[PDB]
Amino acid sequence: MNYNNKILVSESGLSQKHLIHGDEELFQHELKTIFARNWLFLTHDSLIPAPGDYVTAKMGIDEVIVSRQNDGSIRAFLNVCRHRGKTLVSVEAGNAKGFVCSYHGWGFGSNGELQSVPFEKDLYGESLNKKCLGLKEVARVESFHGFIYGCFDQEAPPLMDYLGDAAWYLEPMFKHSGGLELVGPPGKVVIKANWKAPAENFVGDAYHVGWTHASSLRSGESIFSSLAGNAALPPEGAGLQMTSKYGSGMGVLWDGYSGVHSADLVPELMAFGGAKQERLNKEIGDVRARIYRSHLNCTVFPNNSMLTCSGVFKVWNPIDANTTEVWTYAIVEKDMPEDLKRRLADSVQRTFGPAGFWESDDNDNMETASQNGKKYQSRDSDLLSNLGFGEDVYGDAVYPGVVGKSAIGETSYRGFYRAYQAHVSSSNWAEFEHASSTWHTELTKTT
Amino acid sequence: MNYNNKILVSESGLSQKHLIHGDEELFQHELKTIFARNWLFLTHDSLIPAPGDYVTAKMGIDEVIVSRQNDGSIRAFLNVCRHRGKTLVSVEAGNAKGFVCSYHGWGFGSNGELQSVPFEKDLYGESLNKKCLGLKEVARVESFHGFIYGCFDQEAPPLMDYLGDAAWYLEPMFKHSGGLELVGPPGKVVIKANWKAPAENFVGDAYHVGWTHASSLRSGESIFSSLAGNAALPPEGAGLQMTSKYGSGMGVLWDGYSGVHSADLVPELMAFGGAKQERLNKEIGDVRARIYRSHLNCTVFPNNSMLTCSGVFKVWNPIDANTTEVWTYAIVEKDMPEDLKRRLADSVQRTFGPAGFWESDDNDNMETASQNGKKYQSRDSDLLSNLGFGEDVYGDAVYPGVVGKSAIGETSYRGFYRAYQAHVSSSNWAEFEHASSTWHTELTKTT
Amino acid sequence: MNYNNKILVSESGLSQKHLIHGDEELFQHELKTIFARNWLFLTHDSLIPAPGDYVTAKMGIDEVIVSRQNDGSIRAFLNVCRHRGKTLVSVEAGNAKGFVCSYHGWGFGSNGELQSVPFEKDLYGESLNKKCLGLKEVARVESFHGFIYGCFDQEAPPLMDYLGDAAWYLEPMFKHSGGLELVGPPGKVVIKANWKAPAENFVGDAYHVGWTHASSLRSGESIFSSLAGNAALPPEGAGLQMTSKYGSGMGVLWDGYSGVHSADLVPELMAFGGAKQERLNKEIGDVRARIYRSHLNCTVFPNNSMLTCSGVFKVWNPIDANTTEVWTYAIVEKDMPEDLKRRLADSVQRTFGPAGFWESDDNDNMETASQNGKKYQSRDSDLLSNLGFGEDVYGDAVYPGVVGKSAIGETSYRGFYRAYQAHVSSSNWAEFEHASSTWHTELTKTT
Amino acid sequence: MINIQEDKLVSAHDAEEILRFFNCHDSALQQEATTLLTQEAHLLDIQAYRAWLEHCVGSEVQYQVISRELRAASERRYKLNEAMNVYNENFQQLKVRVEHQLDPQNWGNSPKLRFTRFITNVQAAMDVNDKELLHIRSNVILHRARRGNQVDVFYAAREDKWKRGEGGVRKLVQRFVDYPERILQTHNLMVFL
Amino acid sequence: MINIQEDKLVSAHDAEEILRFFNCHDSALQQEATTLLTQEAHLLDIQAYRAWLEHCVGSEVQYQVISRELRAASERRYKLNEAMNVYNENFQQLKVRVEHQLDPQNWGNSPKLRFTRFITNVQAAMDVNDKELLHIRSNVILHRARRGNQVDVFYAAREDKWKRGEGGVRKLVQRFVDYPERILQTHNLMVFL
Amino acid sequence: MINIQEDKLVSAHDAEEILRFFNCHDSALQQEATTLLTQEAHLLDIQAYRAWLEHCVGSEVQYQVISRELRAASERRYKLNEAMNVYNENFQQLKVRVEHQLDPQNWGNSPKLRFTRFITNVQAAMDVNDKELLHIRSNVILHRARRGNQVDVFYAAREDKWKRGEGGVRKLVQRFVDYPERILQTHNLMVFL
């Protein structure tokens, strides 16, 4: 397939070829043009707070070690020995000043440097240039309020610029709340779906909630529970949708601070969020204070998603075109009482974790949609994302980005997929920029 | 591989390259040139007799919904939602006036039309062109005496013409017997063989019976039980073999109406078949009446096989070059007594079903022959199908098609494989026709 | 990938691209340029000593039948029927005068000839040219002191010439000891590693022993047990390393006749080996007699490895780029007392067999090194094999081949990989020879 | 004790079978049943199929394994055959299968197959109406290994009736299995569950 | 009897649990425990989830399944949350899950799922301090088959506490499972172990 | 009761072993055997390998696991070594393996492995000639999970001899396993069956 010319995503993001969820050659191409190019979630400060603390993470199909340095910064390195290529670290988290390879015993520091080699003087003499044999380092590592992302491409925009217009929406919760903590360890489960299937679902799919999750809504008695079985369409003005230049996007369901949490936590959360919002009104203004306590379903392009307020945080780790490893963490506000942090974390996993009754509702949706992209008669078929097209705006006085002022629509899909096309058809960031110079115009056509 | 020029099947069908049973690129090519082009078995009237009845079926690797319309016709559609591509129907059979997608709740009728969309007016307004969003329809659906076949290619010959000379042989049982019923549900088992391995075995392989099935013949005490261990070659004139332009073919073992059925059913069947034959002599003539009660081992190209009289009906559903999903139904004559229909159906599954003691004899044969097509030193080797070559005729006064007037031979393999070459090397039906204009001459060379 | 020009192995064998352990296209290319071209281990005389005895073996991914002929020679044939390609023989060993195919009953002799066909006269008449339908024969089958190797390429050098300079090192044990026996049956286990990972480990990796096998050394109390945890580097002069033109190579650890055997066998072995060495001094000289009772870790290119004295004999049978089927036999000296042969064989399997506590230490090393070759950021990375470079010699007065006069180094890796590059970039043996005309000069650069 | 109007996923058949075991519990019957089934499985695992027929299988046996078609939980109108019989054997039919296993021209049995059966969750209760009829329920994992690298694992619940026959030996008179996997991924179901 | 200073791979928790069973062995308690667990598994296998709650689950239950992060055997400094709760349910939370299973808009339950549970290695001991508290240990293989060709097999050891409740019926008051596979390869863990 | 001339697939060895269990059945011995094996498996599952040696393994033990070469059912002439020993261990050899497991430089044991054993089909009979020798037969499923996504499942029948030793404790004096899979697909067989 010639990805310079192949139209995988139609103009304005209106449709995508079904093969994108099944084609293994494309998957290999995405390793290059999506995963090796863009910003990928690694960890949170709360998980590696002290010098020497480390975790392992996936970046695409690669595995990296993410380590807190003595100077307080974080560096990340491929989890591959520079000698004969064995995986260096076999655990998920720990604290160490270095990593020793179990094959021939080469020892690397927490800073990636090759620090020792067994019997170096007798064997290599002075012939080994250890300064050129440090672990392969992740070029870029940056923080968004404690959330640590990595990028293999030194040419990428800074993480903050990459978030584009989505940053404005995240800031009330990520910054103005006093900050968030990620509660680990994550749940880890493999699903037989393409990574884009859950990524697109979280970035912009409010339409599915009432039907897909009819049983979870009815059974849990959570705040969004009227929609069960599409019994009721939310009011006009119940939220909105937004997307951005570099592909990140989100839905906003106004005031839904208790999110998917069952009736057992609703009163305490609605009280906590509303009390904080009262204090934030004076600091960031009423609109932003209300965004803080509004449920945001977001994907940070390409493969990191979250439900704020519900506190769900996901990484859709790609394995092959129809396999993804799902990592699920809980997000909590640092100033919540400890007992509340514990109950919220358990509730996140109860609903969206490995045995998450909500997440289980989506299994068949994601898996079959993805697997059908392999089927002969469906490869060249068009997946539709036209809901709300011709009613989106850009440059609004109150809400930034390309915005659909409706709770349910496909605005965020269109922006995710215009960003995806531009990358898949580009050889570097400069070309992505050239292909994106009229991004918002493309997305607001017919309005 | 250039399939325009690659000789996969030699002149006259005399041999085939072993790689055809193992090569994944070829398998992908067969999805296009075999499965998307030719007629494939879907179901029987007896399984969807009433309005709203439906079943799911495979066509190649695609899954379709096959539904009885209110006007009595049958239509088939891809089992894929037109919105985001989820599989629509998750059951095998049922009765419904429509199908609702569990992802976003779109509702399609039994006629494939997009009938409803949740909250259409509030969400899409009048922007959704539902008339262009009906399920992707199988272009051609036709019946051969209640047996329903589908074809994705509108250019295909009518099913009756596609059956070619094989139709004459099937008609005594399919038409003149009063008609057949298919007894479901089928057995379903995955084997590690290429779909062509069982297809070729059923289309023309009488040679293997005495040796492969030595133990089943000896143990069951069925009518063909003399051949056990090749203890005895059938008489001259014990049957014949035939093949046709579009690849379908069969063996005829004269008078073997009890087929593989164990001694427990032999007397009742031989009585029933012979009584009907007596009535048919006056209607279709002695030769055709005898064909009615003769055992036909047939493959309807590409991947549907049957043993009449035994009542075995198979679909070799392709998964990949070395994986096939075997569906096994029983065929019974509608005017047989109910208790006899029940016992015959159980006997079909006893011998050829998931725990079929006969079918188990063929497992290793098909699996290793197929898997050996992947092995380096065997890819370019030649599988032989020359038995009986130079003794076949065409245009016989009594028996139509390319015919070998012997019970055991490879006539039917040669015709299956000449049809297969012609398709694999052709871009459309017109080209297949051009490549097949001297089909029978090619098959009767040296006579 | 263009294998004529792609630099997979750098000049002097100093490094290799990590992708070589993961790339499936390369694996397919190795079937052609490595496995179909070179000499591969089949069996030992001791396993098929009498006329009619046979075993099955893998040659690359192909399976062959290896049979003792009435005249005392051995011939090998593909284990594939010449009719429709079924695997002919389903057992691992036996005695027979021929093999009958279970599909249609064709019977082949122990000499590969098609001897019978059921009902030949009635079915084929005189049309079947049986003399052209014998099993596909392995072109070359040769013995090295009872060890039987096969090669599909008639153009290959004789086995003795192929062993090159490595033969001189093996001869004391293989020839002058009175001869070896292979004790079967082998253990058989599948590992998720590329075949080259264990091949390179055995050909030249003494460096890993002290660290990888720290626990096995400590727990077993074997002779090499000082090195546990790299507690001690062997003396200067504790051994050497060597490599050869056609890729075979080995390490020599002087005097280590008890090898990996636990303290229970050390005294008896050291006594037996030393007594034989005393007799050999007068026959082959002190240096060669000492080599006889020195531990040799060797790979016979491409995929057969051994530890003499320990008595471990391995075949790394390739399945795909990250799958290998490991066969483990024991080697014993024919003139050892029977009870000692039994205990040694059990000890070989105890340490290096399916539940070998030593072999288990290497599992993660081989598997992750291999699997990391698939990971995007590691494909183009360089695996290092520079230890000892610029201190190797050729043409030494006492020790032949390219030799590193140190026990621990990477000499043997460099020679294995220069041979591998030359093959992968060559279309035939003549081209390999042209690419290898300055093999030793390339390997001794900077000295 | 189950009300299927409330416990919406429970079939009438399953509710009926539960009832037999929750009432009269006899620890001694449970033990006898465990022995019977362990002995049966040993005979089958060593491929003593003639011995199995002679010692474990009653002359009036019905040995039945079904595969049920996947239908909508809410289906109510489609009434055609719900299942097919993978096995539905009388004694003579079992004997035929046993002869097929033992025939030296059964090429698929060389080299010899290897079977390992794991029987668990044994329950036993005497029938309320026929004092000589023992209901036994058990679950089986059956592991089949052949030809070096073929491995097939089967999982099923078995609903049996056992009755004393010749010599007072309790023998199987009915086995019913509703096989849980619709599409078999074990090459065939050619094993005695 | 285990000294964890010597038996270096054994956790303090595991050593403590062993101790409960090696001391006072009562064959009768083992039998009662086997019955309880076999009945529980039958109810679950037939999807009688309401019946399960009513007959097998105590009002004060804690039903907990953890996934422990992989850490170095020699780790001593990193002290953050060691595990997450796949399940950590009270009775009301279990009831919610049961309602979710039974809702006719649970689309994933059509066609009906098939479950087969195998319970083994049952051990039982009364608590030393609370004479009414029964400790039961058992291992489970759980086989889940759906949608033709999906098959998921779960393996776990279960550490339970059972106590007599309403009507004198012994009911589950605590189940603890440390799930052995870190990364699940079964699509989800949406099963009651 | 088996005649191997008629039951053509049955080996002499297997016919001999059957005979031990069909004759004198003692329900009490079956119970003692079940306890012994359940306790053994618990110790092994928690990786209390020293405890296992001390409490379960006799000083004169032979612990043997074979892999038999695939030969024709009709083979009669080829007489070379029929099998290899995956394990053929005395007490000292088992101790070496246990030390290897416990060594803190056994890199493959970090992070800690997870084992779950399922023991079924227990049969027990006293030896006819040696009144102190107990024959126990049982089947095991052993589940091994490591490194996130590695999962290996082993299946085997075990033929044991147990005898009372120090302190009157019954200890394993012989274990024999004929491993059913010829080519292992579990990376290694480094587990105690």
Ligand SMILES: c1ccc2ccccc2c1
């Ligand atoms: C995915 C996308 C949007 C959502 C909105 C509310 C609750 C759950 C959701 C899950």
Ligand SMILES: c1ccc2ccccc2c1
């Ligand atoms: C396949 C092909 C031909 C046959 C003829 C008779 C019986 C069974 C057969 C199976």
Ligand SMILES: c1ccc2ccccc2c1
């Ligand atoms: C591999 C390579 C070299 C060795 C030397 C001694 C012992 C074991 C070895 C294994």
Ligand code: FES
């Ligand atoms: S592979 Fe890491 S030290 Fe050699």
Ligand code: FES
């Ligand atoms: S995928 Fe079917 S309604 Fe959306």
Ligand code: FES
């Ligand atoms: S495939 Fe061997 S005789 Fe036909």
Ligand SMILES: [Fe+3]
């Ligand atoms: Fe959802």
Ligand SMILES: [Fe+3]
């Ligand atoms: Fe057949």
Ligand SMILES: [Fe+3]
């Ligand atoms: Fe090693």
